[PDB]
Each structure stands twice: as structure tokens, then as C-alpha cells.
Amino acid sequence: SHSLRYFVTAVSRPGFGEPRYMEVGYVDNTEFVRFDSDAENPRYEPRARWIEQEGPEYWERETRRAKGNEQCFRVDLRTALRYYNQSAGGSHTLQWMAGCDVESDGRLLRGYWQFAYDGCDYIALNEDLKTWTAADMAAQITRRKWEQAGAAERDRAYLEGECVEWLRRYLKNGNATLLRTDPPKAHVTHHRRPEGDVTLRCWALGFYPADITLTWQLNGEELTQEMELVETRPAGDGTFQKWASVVVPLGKEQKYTCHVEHEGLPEPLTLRW
């Protein structure tokens, strides 16, 4: 299930100038474009080698779009201050997520287009791509205005047409990096704790994509409660890492086995200490 998504954020800063405006684009949850209004020379920039193959009219057109969006968001941050009747001297946040998920054939599966104010839901386009869900009375104003203007049709034109179409092109031109598969390299470390028992830590390193499951068995039974587990984290080089640990008696370490499941593995790895 592929996807093309854009995450947009504007943060006001009273007495420090105009709001900081940012865009990030992702394909299959992997970052590839980025815009930062506070950058030395602000323009749309490549963030993966594969997108670099696009010509200069692509970067100019997207830079043109980004700088226009930044202007629409300057207005909106002001429109939001009055709806909620807030002081003008404080910092606020407007976030915008938009994109398309696609099933194997190629045509749309779900369209997204939702906004959040100060970290809370504000308005979101329903699955029908025809109506809007508002979170409070402020967003009800926005809803009827966008209803009167016909915002769903124009927004739906993007999601079903262009978004779907360009994602199809991004996957063809970037398949080698996007759809690559890096199997995790696994190993187990030993750690004698003061209490007298042991911590067995099972590491997974250098894998892509991100999804993975670490599980500790004992004589075939999963030990999902006594297990410790960090959130999957980025290595910094495009791959990911994760570890899972358990506490076991000294001497019986060879009874426990760690199981690593990843789409780069035809079969789950199994390892002991």
C-alpha cells in the first residue's frame, strides 16, 4: 500500500517576524522533499538522490507553490486568532496533512486532507471526499465557507488525479531506494544485573523499511509482559534499529530465544545467547 503525503506546519512568533513555514513530502513514509522558510535561501530541496533526477522546472514550480502556501497560512493564523478570540501576542501552530494512499493496481484507496490548530484536530475531509468533519464551532465557520466555495471538489481533484498520478511516477523513478529491502542484522548481548539475575538484550540493526516485530519466547511461549521494548528509531543513514530485552535466571539463558520478523526475511531469524 503506497502513499504520497505532505506534512505542513506554520508557527507564529510574535515580535520575531512572520511565521515559520515548513513542508515535508514523504513517499511510503520516507522523506524526499522539504521546504523551510527560515533556511538560508528558502526553496524546495531534494532529500533523496532519486528525486534529484527531476528537472529545474519541478523545483521552481514546487518552490512557487510552497511560497504561496506560506502566504495562505499567514492569513489563516490570523483568522484563527480571532475565531478563538485569543491574545495576539502569543505563539500558535497550524498543521496540515494531505496526501493519497493507493492500492496495488494504482487508483485511489484513501484521500487525506486535514488540519489541526495548536495540536488539536480542527477540520478534516471525510472518506467520501465530499463532506467535512469539524471539531468545534470555529471550524464550523470554515466548513460552511469551504462548502459554499466548493473546496471538496477542487481538493478531491488533486487527490484522485494528480497525487495518485505523481506517486505512480515517484515509485517508478525511485523504486531502487524506496522499495529496497535491508534485512536486519541481529545479535544478543549479556548483562549481569545487581539483583543477581541477568538481562538478555536482543538487537536488530541496519534494517529497512521500519516495520518489525521483536518477540522473546521461552519453550515456544511468547513473553509479552515481562519484555522491555524501545520505540523503533532512525539510525541516521536511512535504516532503523530496535532492541527488546528480558530478565532471566542465571544458568538458564540458553532456554530463551529471540524472534525477529521483517519483510526482508523470508523466515524469521532465531538466536540464543
Partner: peptide, 5 residues
Amino acid sequence: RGPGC
């Protein structure tokens, strides 16, 4: 490509 406003 991305969306606008």
C-alpha cells in the same frame, strides 16, 4: 507534486 493552500 504537492497541494496548494
